[model samples]
Target: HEAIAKRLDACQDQLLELYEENSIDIHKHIMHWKCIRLESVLLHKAKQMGLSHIGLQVVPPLTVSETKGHNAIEMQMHLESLAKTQYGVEPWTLQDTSYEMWLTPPKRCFKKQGNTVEVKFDGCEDNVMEYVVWTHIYLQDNDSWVKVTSSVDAKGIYYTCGQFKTYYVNFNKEAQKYGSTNHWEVCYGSTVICSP
Candidate 1:
């Protein structure tokens, strides 16, 4: 079983991009914090020696609905491959270090003007930030939680408030049902999430 386990593990590399029968494969994701300079904090002592292929890392890591257990880290990008220096590596450069990326499940806030919602954001420490929102909207015909037909793709590392950043989510019919029966999960970014 030892060798068998190792063999299957290695195969995940090939199937990372495609769903391989109940297996975890987020070739396009991982999930980060902070407004601190991306390279400055990461380079730290290593800045003295100097090396290229620099890559930053994610903090909390991202998880898709398809994922089970503790949110599989699909985009680790190898800070371990991190033995060195500068210029910041590209997203798919393979085995490099000090790269820039967003943290997951950032900060989520709900503003209520009696339940109507608005979509918006504020900087943390006043630093500019990015975000993705996941929402669960109720279905009429089926009476269920949906992917938010008006909402964009939820398959990657990004999201929107389904349609509301504020709580107007509760303001409006069956279509208005959107704001009323919604659940939102917001994701944020930072350099604080790296392993190196």
Candidate 2:
């Protein structure tokens, strides 16, 4: 066990130095989420400790170059891939992020129908579909969110227009997660609108 102890000491020392070089206060609220080297070392340690949830708000950028500009979906997917390779499981799932723009219901036009809600996409008024590369309705499942439904395609508005797009929560599946009232959200491209 001495060998393991020695290695752990070395690892802790290395982490201290890395964080110091980046001006990260390990005692502070944020343990340097933006530091690439620090986050990598932390992930490596977390995996070794058999931890399932590390409370990481966002996945750290993959590399030093990516630290400047990283996309949330891309970063989470990359981390998911890493988890699959190392642990044979995808523990890191992507979260909703509004990268560029998001559409909100008009001033007084919101609809709530039992287990479902009607979300309008008239923000653009004209060619509202043009801004949508992908769109979905999501509902929170406890601490995490899940995709409930979405438009058929970019050009198809089965869930975006005509007949009024309404998203119904899959109660059976949600019930498996304890059947709690969850905030719903809508996503268009990188944009997202969620209930308070």
Candidate 3:
């Protein structure tokens, strides 16, 4: 047991060193290191628990860049550039001015039992016109929780919860006339089951 723990520790250390040496672009480095850092921490905890096999899942990086123009046609070009550079695919043009692309990981698991947890939406203090158009939940196969649902609040408070599992959440905001911002936050505790 001790020998295996030592080896895992060494492997994590090596990955960290490699990340430090190879990372050139700050954004790319940060994106890639997120998994490595998480694995390192999990490995330490697993070692203490004396778990021989610690399963670590790597999450692919999702990057989104916003573009604006006088009209939809101009904005489409900007969206195309982002799609080509990020995913090597072309984005279909939607009637709406906004465009988005998702470069999903190679491997992902879908759950048969899960609920879309709801989250409250609070507008910024300065802008009453502010609104949330979309919400995203990052999931893992081993996690107990699998989904999230979101709704708007009269008082502008947003809440999200679902089957007990750890996952990441993000809100995509689009100010009336401006662009959008994707803000993410982490959730905790056991997943909440919705009552039918």
Candidate 4:
């Protein structure tokens, strides 16, 4: 893993240098787009180097004004630090044997509105079917609990919420070989407004 991290750092540095030299025409949005695309490239490289899982996060926007697009360099350095601090070291999962659902709010949103809500449970083995209450909206009549869709990455379940919704997860249940389900285990709420 250490070797892989070194390779990743090198890769990021090289990408940054390349972008810095040729970023004359690049805009901030384009820089961010390039950053995301390049991270996926690193993910591909990580997998080839025998690294199983890598998680990408949404970084905060820059507060300072830009001059001649030098912010790309800062963005690149930010990526390097995120890679080193978050994904560089040996993971704690190798040392622990217990599996538990650690719930957290989804930090990313769309247009300052709701997006996917998630739960972190590394214990999911074979036959474990996961479910989450996507969103409960107030309809014209009675309220409706709608299940948009659930998605799972290397971490855990991330379910979509349209609007006017709350989210929850179900744990410690049993069914077909290691499979389970839920309605609302951990309730989380939010407000969303849309205009025409």
- Each model's lDDT comes to 0.24, 0.33, 0.33, 0.34
Model 4 CA lDDT for position 36: 45
Q: What value does the lDDT take at residue 119 in candidate 4? A: 30
Best-performing candidate as measured by lDDT: 4
Clashing residue pairs in all predictions, respectively, total: 36, 0, 15, 0
Q: What is the per-residue lDDT of model 2 for residues 107-128, given as tens digits with 9 covering 90 to 100?
A: 1111111122222333322212
Q: Per-residue alpha-carbon lDDT of model 3 for 71-132, expressed as tens digits?
A: 22333333333333422132222211122222221013211112233332232334323223
Task: For candidate 1, write residues 1-196 as lDDT tens digits.
Answer: 2242243334333344322333222222221201122222333323333432223322221222123221222223322121121211223221111122222122121111111122212212222223333342212122222222212221223224445433212211212333333222223332122111
Candidate 4 per-residue lDDT, tens place, 44-77, comes to 4555565555335222222221221243354334
Superior candidate under lDDT, 3 versus 4: 4
TM-score of each: 0.20, 0.20, 0.21, 0.20
Q: Candidate 4 has which clashing residue pairs, if any?
A: none
Model 2, residue 155: C-alpha shift (Å): 12
For model 1, the stretches where C-alpha displacement exceeds 4 angstroms are 17-143, 147-196
Q: Lowest lDDT 10-mer window, candidate 2?
A: 105-114
Question: After best superposition, candidate 1 residue 179: deviation in angstroms?
Answer: 30
Q: Native-vs-model 2 lDDT?
A: 0.33
